[PDB]
Amino acid sequence: SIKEQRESLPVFQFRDQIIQAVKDNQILIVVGETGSGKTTQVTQYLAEAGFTKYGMIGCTQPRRVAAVSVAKRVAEEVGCQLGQEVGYTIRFEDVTSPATKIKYMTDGMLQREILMDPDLKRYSVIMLDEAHERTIATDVLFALLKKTVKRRPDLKVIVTSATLDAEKFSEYFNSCPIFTIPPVEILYSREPEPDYLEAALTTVMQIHLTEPPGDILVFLTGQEEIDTACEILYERMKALGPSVPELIILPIYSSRKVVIATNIAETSITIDYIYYVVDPGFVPISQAQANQRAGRAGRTGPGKCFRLYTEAAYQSEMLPTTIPDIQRQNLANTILLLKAMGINDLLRFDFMDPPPVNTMLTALEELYALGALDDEGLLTRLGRKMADFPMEPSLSKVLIASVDKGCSDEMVTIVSMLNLQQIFYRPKDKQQQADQKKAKFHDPTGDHLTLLNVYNAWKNSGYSNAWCFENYIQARAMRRARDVRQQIVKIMERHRHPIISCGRDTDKIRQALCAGFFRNTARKDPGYKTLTEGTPVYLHPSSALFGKQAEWVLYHELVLTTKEYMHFTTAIEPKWLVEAAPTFFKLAP
């Protein structure tokens, strides 16, 4: 039943108590142990209590997927169509209606939303649900909401927290109350294991045979560690014997079952029926993170956690408080927005956890080199124009540069294609066959123009799914690209940025892509080496210029599956970098 499921949750007992705490206290810290359902239920409770009469309820989630996942879930519970009373907003996916009482979104959208109205009048209550996997963009929000609260008293702010992080939050938010919302044994090693990988595998071996049935979850650091573990565990399982229950071993890089994942994956997994966790505790992690990890065993039933370090280590060489995760490109975006609110002076800024000065100086230098900031560091005309685009400052810079070069039509398509997850379906039985079809779209210049070739031919075939399948192109991905393209075209048109085509002048198109994306360039070494930092990076085999020789290249992203790899590489001329990417590479007259 919908009611029965809702009432089953631990929060429902404290449901009347939560509403009173919000009604009295302006800012409220909520500690809910995972599986309390504070994420879904609290939003409804405040809606049910009439907080949506004169405002919306907004909740920020750490990832895009989480905001979509919670919104759909809450929609079912509320019993209404997604986007109507309960909707989510994420980048280029605003699933909301005028009739939207409850809204879910990422920190970035809130930052765009707060910049437009520093008082957030459209909202009655703002809740940030990122107890774990908090960033600096989330920390910036805290300081902004602290000021917003001093000018709009009716506004309610809820801030979820981990138990270790809780008291620090309360001190920061003017000593406001900490509302709290209510089994596994943790095992340690007497001496620090010399080899964490060997220890962890032996640990997985003993637990598979010598323990009651449960599923094991292991965490590792690198891909080569994962691959080595898969081979070792296969070899030991086959040698062990046929009587022994089969061990199904699956890795994740986002009879009994073993799952092995990295930190990237740990933040995005809700797998059930696992009674055992192996915690190598070294990426070194924090006590709050270690405790969160321990809890994951306790999800389905009782169970055990195996931390591969001394207890003293837990209490000595591990800090409890979360360290906010800093993304270099996200931080540039955050700083750009802050300067668009007229907030300079990052040194005296009310940061709850001060970011390292290098991170802020690199971000400032990156924006300066893009020409978002002048010599002083004050926001320029170009910076304000870029801040109107909800994307990384490199991509927004490329769009505006293309308008100057009369090639905005091709760029909006290329920019659309960069956001895409998977573009080409590949099946191992027909892998060779798929690669042959991909080759038709290969442009000499590089992957950027190859993406332009894919979308154009898709457009030319009237956007046919049969055509997509004919060429082993993900049909869903192209549809997503068009949705993004249409939204970008509307954003450009609203600002004074027209759409002009130039008949695939590859020189103008790649020149445009050098205006931004100039700190992601590399030169061929007798693989390649990065111009900016000197880091060695390699062409991916799937690249359109992978066979070809190309002395100077430009890459959209830098993936690390095994060794540093450039994602979407395009051959460019050095001249354009001096000319179109001025400040950084003007080592000419």
Numbering used by the authors: 549 to 730, 735 to 806, 824 to 852, 870 to 1112, 1115 to 1177
Give passages from the manuscript.
DEAH-box adenosine triphosphatases (ATPases) play a crucial role in the spliceosome-mediated excision of pre-mRNA introns. The catalytic activation, the catalysis itself as well as the final disassembly steps are driven by so-called DEAH-box helicases. They all belong to the helicase superfamily 2 (SF2) and share at least eight conserved sequence motifs (motifs I, Ia, Ib, II, III, IV, V and VI) spread over two RecA-like domains that together form the helicase core. Two RecA-like domains, referred to as RecA1 and RecA2, build up the helicase core. The RecA2 domain contains an anti-parallel β-hairpin present in all DExH-box helicases, which protrudes out of the RecA2 domain thereby contacting the C-terminal domains. These domains are divided in three distinct domains, namely the winged-helix (WH), the helix-bundle (HB) and the oligonucleotide-binding (OB) domain.
